[PDB]
């Protein structure tokens, strides 16, 4: 469906599509190939369902936390740089683009927040968070403000939340504990709280947004405002006097800003693939590629040496490092997308008063954990109604939901397949489930029949207990390396086209009640 003999290539707004578009026409100037740039909205949420049908662009640009996913579903060519290509990037920047050990996209830029100050109102930043109130009282008193951010994406807010201790999926020992989930925790209820008193005592509004707090800040009404390199070109055109400094601290705590890595992806559905890797590392990824681009926005820290060499020397850039040291290189696991859901509720429901901060960051803890709490469920009941034999794996955080929502799938299940074998059988035969290939057929048609009907429970166990019974199918053919992806895919349609509903019941728990 991709057209063969051109490039398209689709960035976000906020960066240097016209810069981007310059290192196309110097692509085109050699091969004749026509590269376009898009600026589509919602990029990163529209690529995963264009890409699973075979369209979208060639290349897709944006931070790196959002890869794994498209990486898990299949839609990005696997990178492979030679040794003398590699060497020229800094070695974190390809470990924030490598899933499952592949390398699955080119990394182009490190991005952190930082604190962006006018020092003409400001002549020094402030040193902690708590102080703010207090400078705008000060700052009100002359017709001006202390800061003005976006409150409508929580990467912006995520380093306060994240200072006391807030975190998404806990990282020791080099290593995710993805059942461990931070978002609900005394740290991250401190700052989330800060947050919410600034907003109740007038020193900020909940409304504000990008552009709001853009034009604040770039007309000199604002004192101060919390963005990211991309920024930089229309504070220098306002000529606001301004600074980039390391953010405040919050009880002490440095703010952890969650760094990302801008990168291209190639879609696995492109016939282009050779073109791309093409422009990307011998037009892009050269000291003159990422000038153009960074001439027209701001990349931040790039990952080419040659070319961050010279950056480095910025003040602003060095001010944007010691930000990314202080907070974390995001995770690039497909469960991101949720988590970032989750958070962004969170932070514009506490906002606005439509949930307390106990009340929002319950249900974001609930949405960030939905995927590995309902997989440990449907993977441990697919395998012992397969095997005969439940795991003996212990169950882990949130056990105790887990153990009861197994026991009463049992229960239900094992009804459901009983009193339903004659269609479940029936439905067997007709799919005709040999291998691999025929279980990704019956999963296509799984994620319609499921989705188009009424959301209950009943529904979601017919599901997994159809799965079950295919898993039992499995098993006798010697096919029992299928039944873990058919799990993942359950799992899948469950918590992506019912989440809202699953987290109005309190997820498992639920289900649990429910049938009690
Ligand atoms: C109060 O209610 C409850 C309380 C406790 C427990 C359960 C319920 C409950 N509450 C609600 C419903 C049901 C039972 O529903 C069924 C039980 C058995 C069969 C059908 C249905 C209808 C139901 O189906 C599904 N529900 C949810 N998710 C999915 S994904 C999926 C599915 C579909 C195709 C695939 F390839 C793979 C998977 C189906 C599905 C839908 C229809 C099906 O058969 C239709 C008849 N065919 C069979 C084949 N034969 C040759 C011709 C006649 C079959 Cl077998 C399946 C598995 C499906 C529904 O849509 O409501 N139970
Ligand atoms: O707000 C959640 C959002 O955060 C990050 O997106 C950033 C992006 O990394 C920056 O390059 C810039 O465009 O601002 C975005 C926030 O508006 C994550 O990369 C993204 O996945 C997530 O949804």
Redesign the pocket.
């Known amino acids: 469906k991709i057209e063969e003999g051109k490039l398209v290539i689709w960035i976000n707004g906020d960066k240097g599509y016209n810069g981007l578009a310059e290192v196309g026409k110097k692509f085109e100037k050699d091969t004749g190939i026509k590269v376009t740039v898009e600026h589509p909205d919602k990029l990163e949420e529209k690529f995963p369902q264009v890409a699973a049908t075979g369209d979208g662009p060639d290349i897709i640009f944006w931070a790196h936390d959002r890869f794994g996913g498209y990486a898990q579903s299949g839609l990005l060519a696997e990178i492979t740089p030679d040794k003398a290509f590699q060497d020229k990037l800094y070695p974190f920047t390809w470990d924030a683009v490598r899933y499952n050990g592949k390398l699955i996209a080119y990394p182009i830029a490190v991005e952190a927040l930082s604190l962006i100050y006018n020092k003409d109102l400001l002549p020094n930043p402030p040193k902690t968070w708590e102080e703010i109130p207090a400078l705008d009282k000060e700052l009100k008193a002359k017709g001006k403000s202390a800061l003005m951010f976006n409150l409508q994406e929580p990467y912006f807010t995520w380093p306060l939340i994240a200072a006391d201790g807030g975190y998404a999926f806990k990282y020791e020992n080099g290593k995710y504990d993805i059942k461990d989930v931070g978002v609900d925790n005394a740290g991250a209820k401190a700052g989330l709280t800060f947050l919410v008193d600034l907003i109740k005592n007038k020193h900020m509004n909940a409304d504000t947004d990008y552009s709001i707090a853009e034009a604040a800040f770039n007309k000199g009404e604002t004192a101060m405002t919390i963005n990211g390199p991309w920024a930089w070109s229309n504070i220098d055109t306002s000529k606001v006097n301004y600074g980039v400094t390391v953010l405040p601290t919050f009880k002490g705590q440095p703010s952890k800003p969650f760094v990302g890595v801008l990168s291209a992806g190639i879609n696995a559905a492109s016939p282009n693939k050779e073109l791309a890797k093409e422009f990307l590392e011998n037009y892009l990824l050269t000291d003159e590629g990422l000038e153009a681009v960074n001439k027209d926005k701001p990349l931040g820290a790039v990952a080419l040496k040659s070319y961050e060499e010279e950056l480095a020397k910025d003040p602003r850039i060095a001010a944007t490092m010691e930000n990314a040291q202080k907070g974390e290189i995001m995770p690039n696991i497909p469960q991101m997308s949720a988590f970032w859901y989750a958070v962004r509720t969170a932070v514009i429901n506490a906002a606005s008063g439509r949930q307390t901060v106990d009340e929002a960051l319950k249900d974001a803890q609930t949405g960030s954990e939905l995927y590995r709490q309902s997989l440990e469920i449907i993977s441990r009941y697919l395998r012992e109604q397969a095997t005969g034999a439940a795991d003996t794996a212990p169950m882990g955080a949130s056990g105790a939901t887990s153990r009861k929502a197994l026991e009463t799938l049992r229960r239900?299940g094992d009804?459901?397949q009983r009193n339903?074998e004659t269609?479940?059988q029936?439905?067997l035969?007709?799919?005709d489930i040999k291998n691999e290939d025929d279980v990704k057929s019956?999963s296509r048609?799984?994620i319609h029949?499921?989705s188009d009907?009424?959301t209950?429970?009943?529904?979601?166990?017919?599901?997994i207990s159809?799965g079950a019974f295919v898993a039992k199918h499995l098993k006798t053919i010697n096919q029992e390396s299928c039944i873990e992806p058919l799990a993942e895919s359950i799992t899948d349609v469950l918590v992506r086209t019912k989440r809202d509903w699953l987290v109005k019941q309190r997820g498992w728990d639920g289900f649990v009640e429910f049938?009690h």
């Open positions: 239900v009804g459901v339903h269609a479940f029936g439905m035969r007709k799919l019956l048609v799984m029949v499921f009907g009424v209950n429970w009943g529904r979601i166990v017919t599901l159809f049938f």
